[PDB]
Amino acid sequence: KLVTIGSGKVFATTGYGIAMQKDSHWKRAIDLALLQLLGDGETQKLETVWLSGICQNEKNEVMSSKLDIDNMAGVFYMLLVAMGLALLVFAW
């Protein structure tokens, strides 16, 4: 019963990073290793293991909250048309 507005489609779209001290010599190796991991699909395996909720996004079609605006609008349209016809008969 919780959903996000669309999916993060008009926002800052940044990413999580590994903070390091400025001018650190670990930066080159760490970035290269992270890029290798992302390209090899190990990161995708980690997302599968950890960042996976109930089934999938669970579209589930209409879980509840039935909408029938067309039906009630047509209902009122027919009732008004009938009453107008009765008024027209009264006119004659």
């Binding site: 779209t13 990413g15 290269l32 890029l35």
Partner: protein, 50 residues
Amino acid sequence: GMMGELLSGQADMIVAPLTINNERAQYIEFSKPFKYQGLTILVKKEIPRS
């Protein structure tokens, strides 16, 4: 291509939809990504139409 032209000194910056990956990063340095997107498949709507 663009990688060869940049590495040979013919250019000083590649302003283009250049994908960041480990193969290229070993020789050049990328900036922080200005776009986030993946690979996908393009097809058509039905054989001719619905």
